[PDB]
Antibody, heavy 217, light 211 residues
């Protein structure tokens, strides 16, 4: 079981420079070329950078030359991407990816899950969580409202993740204010509504905040 | 140094054969991988060497071409094949990804479950009052949601969201969120969304009267 964990990047100011890390394990790191591929929110994959196992050759995309630098610490089974002169439009999810075989002319067969980097002068704000309690409106529906936060993203689980059936967590949508807002809702058997406790767990990594609202009829 | 996937989108029904192409501007040769990316997940390698297939990936994903014009085929679309698909060259840098190709499964019409939520007292203590109308599990994806406060049909002050098509049953869920400040919300009483959808014989209006 090969796994690649990216980290480091949250909010970063234009012009300034952030460094993404990708510790890897579950295969011999010394052997495979590594890549960085990035995906702009609501846009395609884009290939950022590449590096041979022994750091001995390197390529960047034109979008990236002169600002980013790929690098790797084979001893600490880790892969880096120093990102300098960050533009507003560098905002994307950033994946690292192992190569199929002992060759650079080779596909990307495991991908990390990818850290979101946001490039903006604005300031981070934790979200107000509000209960969407079930009323009139066989089954009934209840949920949470995750209002006015920045930057992306938040994670919503229900009853600490034990509740999964029939959950919709919507895509966050940016407001006039410049903050994101969010709704996470469940269909429930109404029978349980007076006996079953439903709690949503919001968790905004970039503002260190974490909240657990309990929804009641 | 450039690769053109075609077409951009395609809504196929279950069982169908679906073909995506990928046109390299140089001579990739056998050197082409095909990537599947499911909604809000990383990508997965389906095909490499333009024609070889990664372990455990289903026989139904099959790609071909050599050199310059390439072509991925899904010989019998299942419901979980609603992803986005990418091609990529890897002879030599730049390992360019194709424009993408989103694929939407096409099921029979399904009307939507509709719920409505007045603002929490929690939120009114904080000055603004947003009303949420939910559209629960439907197809096709489009539906007109229309807000009306005291029948005055509101305009410009509500925003929708929409979930990705379900990998199981290929249905969408939408949320429209009307957003007023405590003072606007406190004047009117009759608060309503009304939903038009293809699966609906006539429009639905769930509503509440307080504020």
């Amino acid at each position: 079981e090969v796994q690649l964990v990216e980290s480091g990047g949250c909010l970063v100011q234009p012009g300034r420079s952030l460094r993404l890390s990708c510790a890897a394990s579950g295969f011999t790191f010394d052997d495979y070329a590594m890549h960085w591929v990035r995906q702009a929110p609501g846009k395609g994959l884009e290939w950022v950078s590449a590096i041979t196992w022994n750091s001995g050759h390197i390529d960047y995309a034109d979008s990236v030359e002169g600002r980013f630098t790929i690098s790797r610490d084979n001893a600490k089974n880790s892969l880096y991407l120093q990102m300098n002169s960050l533009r507003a439009e560098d905002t994307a999810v950033y994946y690292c990816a192992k190569v199929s075989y002992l060759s650079t002319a080779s596909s990307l067969d495991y991908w990390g899950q990818g850290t979101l980097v946001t490039v903006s002068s604005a300031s981070t704000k934790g979200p107000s969580v509000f209960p969407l309690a079930p009323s009139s409106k066989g089954t009934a529906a209840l949920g949470c409202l995750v209002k006015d936060y920045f930057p992306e993203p938040v994670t919503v689980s229900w009853n600490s993740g034990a509740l999964t059936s029939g959950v919709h967590t919507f895509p966050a949508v940016l407001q006039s204010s410049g903050l994101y807002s969010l709704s996470s809702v469940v269909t429930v058997p109404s029978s349980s509504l007076g006996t079953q406790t439903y709690i949503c767990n919001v968790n905004h990594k970039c503002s260190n905040t974490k909240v657990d609202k309990k929804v009641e009829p | 140094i450039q690769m053109t996937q075609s077409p951009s989108s395609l809504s196929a029904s279950v069982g169908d054969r679906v073909t995506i192409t990928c046109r390299a501007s140089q001579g990739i040769r056998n050197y082409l991988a095909w990537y599947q990316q499911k909604c809000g997940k990383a990508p997965k390698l389906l095909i490499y060497a333009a024609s070889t297939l990664q372990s455990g990936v289903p026989s139904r994903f099959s790609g071909s071409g050599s050199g310059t014009d390439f072509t991925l085929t899904i010989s019998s679309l299942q419901p979980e094949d609603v992803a986005t698909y990418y091609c990529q060259r890897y002879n030599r840098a730049p390992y360019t990804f194709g424009q993408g190709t989103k694929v939407e499964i096409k099921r029979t019409v399904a009307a939507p479950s509709v719920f409505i939520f007045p603002p929490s007292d929690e939120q009114l203590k904080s000055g603004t009052a947003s009303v949420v109308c939910l559209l629960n599990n439907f197809y096709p994806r489009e539906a007109k949601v229309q807000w009306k406060v005291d029948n005055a049909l509101q305009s410009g002050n509500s925003q929708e969201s929409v979930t990705c098509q379900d990998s199981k049953d290929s249905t969408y869920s939408l949320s429209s969120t009307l957003t007023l400040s405590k003072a606007d919300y406190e004047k009117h009483k009759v608060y309503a969304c009304e939903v038009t959808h293809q699966g609906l014989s006539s429009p639905v209006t769930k509503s509440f009267n307080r504020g």
